[model samples]
Target: DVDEKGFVSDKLRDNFFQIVRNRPENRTCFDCESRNPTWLSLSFAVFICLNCSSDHRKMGVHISFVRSSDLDKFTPIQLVRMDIGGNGRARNYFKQVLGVNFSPKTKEYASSICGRQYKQILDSEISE
Candidate 1:
């Protein structure tokens, strides 16, 4: 347990959260984007609602790579690689498959639409 104590440096955590707090898109769920998200997708590179996060988990790690924003070990690599709090990079990738106007509404969040969209986008690239 002590091993991961230093896994995330204070500097890294500070910068990460600072960005998370500052960014409007990052402040909300990456999927429905209707609520403040406490969960994260270590793969697709964004914060999402618990509902959306669960869908990501179902798609499997190679796809969504789900994690907890409150209890996950974050690093600078994830920041640059996944654009954790930026949402810009991830949206760039998402728009490719979902088109520019594919924002999901919270009214339909409970539906499998979130999962389907997640699978369609992130799970599009997978292997053994």
Candidate 2:
């Protein structure tokens, strides 16, 4: 059944909501640590706030394709990514793998250096 957002399936849309509410970590912005994030980088499966979503958009689609958690239709792959990945995991990945500070509040996170990291994460996510 179609959702209010015209999602192809109600179950698919419900799955998205489940991920967001299932974990406290997923409820906050992945980048800036803001509360109750409604936006997400579908490629990376990381939730983010509106400010961070715009930053993701600025990074371009290849590096960070974004969508609204409440307003957009979700593909199965996107849902799977979110189910497997989250803010805590992504933040830890950045700190441990890239050895860099990451937050939308900082200029460094929005730089080319971090963009490469996002691309790397997206590539790995897509490969899985």
Candidate 3:
């Protein structure tokens, strides 16, 4: 997921690398690190590790989203698929979790600004 500033963090980078390394070749692009077109292209299933039992129990919510093309092939008994259509959890998270204002105009501007910033991140590497 993108951070509040719309940039992907180093933690996210490492997590993504781990996911890519573990996923099957056909499930994702072979060169996903360089070839993935959008942040949404990389999806994740939320889970808490064994060491985080307390936090996991407190949260108790495991969610995941996959690309639409991949949806039909998998059968997930507990999973429920929903269409976000641009106004979904991410927008709500910005409003509720981060206490950011949400409006159509604000969303438009924020998306444009974030898209530019995302491109900048791709163009430059993290400096030591």
Candidate 4:
């Protein structure tokens, strides 16, 4: 689940990353090699890499674009119809997993970026 701050719980985040990493179609971004690479669910279908910045150091994750259609084959939730926007999932996840209070803006941005990527994948599918 996405937190109101737009971040996913560590458990979910780690699981998602593992799935992506295991997929042959998804490759780690250039910056992700040195950095530990954290995963962020932009939407149900789209996931991004984060934590590549110097500030984040090796902890920063990269934001690689993944197609929602590809992810849909494996993900439990629909890429376009996620329910983390208005619920307490964000708050609860942050408090329980992240142990930090994330700014609301961060969550919104992450969600928006993820949603955009998911839409891109859908568009690709339609074109094909």
Candidate 5:
């Protein structure tokens, strides 16, 4: 059955809610650390605020997949990917393996730099 937001399955919906609520950054954006993010990067498993979520979309569908918390419907498999996504894990993967830093203090985790550069870096690095 569909929820008010168009989520079609309760099992998928409930697990999605469960993981979102359980994360430490539950009410905040994983990147900027802003509060009450209404969006998510489906591929990254990171909660995102409005402006940053826009970055994910522009960063292209390949870099990361994004969806709205209250507006988008997701599948069980998709939600499972979200369940596996987390900020710390992303922080490590994007940094330790690729050498791309995402620390808020690094001045790289904001508009035009964070997701944009990330797409380029990941693509370039993976291609080699």
Candidate 6:
């Protein structure tokens, strides 16, 4: 525990929270648009609500990966991805690909056709 303590500092947690608080798009769930999302899909680098997080779990790790934003200890790569990707980036990409009418909430998230489409897109775009 002591050996692994150096990287998991208070500042790292603060940085994650700060981004979630200040980033307007991150204030809501990336999938369902619910407010004050507490879970993060580190694979997609987007914040999500508890319900949406369950959807992510159902989709499996090959499609989407999730972690508790408040409870989980994050790695540098996870934090970097969150900082660079976020909801706004994902939203823009979805808008460009799926058009403006796309509603992840009404689309039933991972249970819908769009989720499959999203998986295809991720296969093309995201390497990790």
Error of 5 at 108 (Å): 7.2
Name the candidate, 2 or 3, with the larger lDDT value.
2
Which ten contiguous residues of candidate 1 have the minimum total lDDT? 104-113
Which RMSD values do the candidates have, in order?
6.2, 3.8, 17.5, 15.1, 6.4, 4.1
- TM-score leader: 6
- Output the better candidate (2/6) by TM-score: 6
Q: What is the TM-score of each candidate against the true structure?
A: 0.61, 0.72, 0.20, 0.27, 0.61, 0.73
Q: What tens-digit string does per-residue lDDT give for candidate 2 at 1-128? A: 55565445756676657656459878777777778888887766678899888877887676678888788787555666777777777676667655754444652543456556764675576676
lDDT of each: 0.58, 0.69, 0.29, 0.36, 0.61, 0.69
lDDT (Cα, tens digit) per residue for candidate 3, span 11-124:
544444345334332232211222221222111221212222232233322211323222222222112111111223334333453355444222232334443343233223
* Model 3: worst 10 consecutive residues (lDDT sum): 77-86
Q: Give per-residue CA lDDT, model 4, range 43-66, as digits (tens).
A: 322223444222222222232232
How far does residue 24 in candidate 2 sit from its true spot (Å)? 1.6
Model 6 reaches what TM-score against the true structure? 0.73
Residue pairs of candidate 6 with colliding backbone atoms: none
List candidate 5 stretches off by more than 4 Å.
1-7, 10-15, 98-101, 104-128
lDDT of 5 by residue, 41-103 (tens): 765566778988877777666566788866677765555555555565556555654464446
The Cα RMSD in angstroms, rounded to one decimal, for candidate 3 relative to the true structure is: 17.5
Task: Work out candidate 1's RMSD over C-alphas.
Answer: 6.2
RMSD of 2: 3.8
Candidate 4 residues lying further than 4 Å off, grouped into runs, are: 28-128
Q: Comparing candidate 1 with candidate 3, which one achieves the higher TM-score?
A: 1
